[PDB]
């Protein structure tokens, strides 16, 4: 599913991402935009063989199990397929654990290079929340 900007912002807000561990809702909307362009079925095979899954492109090397990644630590304790649903619950829950790690949102290259340092609140402006 390809989310609409405000549709996703509202969903993420309901899923408790606004100000989660210090990150305003805009950061998450922006991260999803640049990681997958709001596409929950997004998938990218990495160089090391691992694969990024979902709207937040969570990697199978550390976070989920896709049964084809030798290193896979499956820190989020879920099959990567759960991250390809139009129901963002699984991705959000995993994202929360990820961000609870030392790197914070820095775990997402797209957020580090396209969102950090900018007016991320712009991503939720005009949305009724």
């Amino acid at each position: 599913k390809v989310f609409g900007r405000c549709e996703l912002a509202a969903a993420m807000k309901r899923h408790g991402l606004d100000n989660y561990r210090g990150y305003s809702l805009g950061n998450w909307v922006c991260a999803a935009k640049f990681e997958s362009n709001f596409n929950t079925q997004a998938t990218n095979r990495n160089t090391d063989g691992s694969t990024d899954y979902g709207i937040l492109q969570i990697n199978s090397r550390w976070w989920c199990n896709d049964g084809r990644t030798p290193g896979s630590r499956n820190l989020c304790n879920i099959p990567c397929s759960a991250l390809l649903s139009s129901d963002i619950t699984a991705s959000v829950n995993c994202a929360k654990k990820i961000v609870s790690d030392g790197n914070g949102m820095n775990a997402w290259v797209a957020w580090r290079n396209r969102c950090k340092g900018t007016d991320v609140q712009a991503w939720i402006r005009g949305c009724r929340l």
Partner: antibody
Amino acid sequence: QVQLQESGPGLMKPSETLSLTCSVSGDSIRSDYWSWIRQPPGKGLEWIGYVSYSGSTYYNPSLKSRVTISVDTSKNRFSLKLNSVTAADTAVYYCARWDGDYWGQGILVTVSS
Amino acid sequence: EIVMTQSPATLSVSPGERATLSCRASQSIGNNLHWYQQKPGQAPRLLIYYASQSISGIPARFSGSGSGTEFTLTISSLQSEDFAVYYCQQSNSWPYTFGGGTKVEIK
């Protein structure tokens, strides 16, 4: 089946350093986030801190830098270190997975002046 | 830190009766509120996570609702084994904090 188990001194004197360990079975210590929580007798619950997969730690400011949480991947366990203990530190100490899904049974630690 | 306040401190319930426990956050925490049940001499057991998500193995009579700063744990028809102290806990902000607890006891 996942099982956490706390172990350490049940009695100590003030100013001493509390050392506790939590051994895990049925799950890999290096494949998750782990924490410590305590409950003073007759009181509620207070988070002590947790350590994530990258080794980064988060400590409760209420402890005022007297706490250390570390991991011993070789023995699939993690520990808690609390310096300069006083009666205010008497409590049942629990270890648990970050997600809160699994908890140790807790260990009573009494600091006797 | 975010202050979590539970009410009532003690809740008397007759077996079979509905039980409603409240929890409030000093500031908005979205859906980052988890409920635990703690029986004497035992560690708290997670019942509900992220305000309303259920855990496998947990009786259907346990249900959580609410968002922002007001949350509720409902036991549709309390059974005698449900007597215990219940705690809410937020994970939106570090340090994570627990409410003061609600002691549910037989009436």
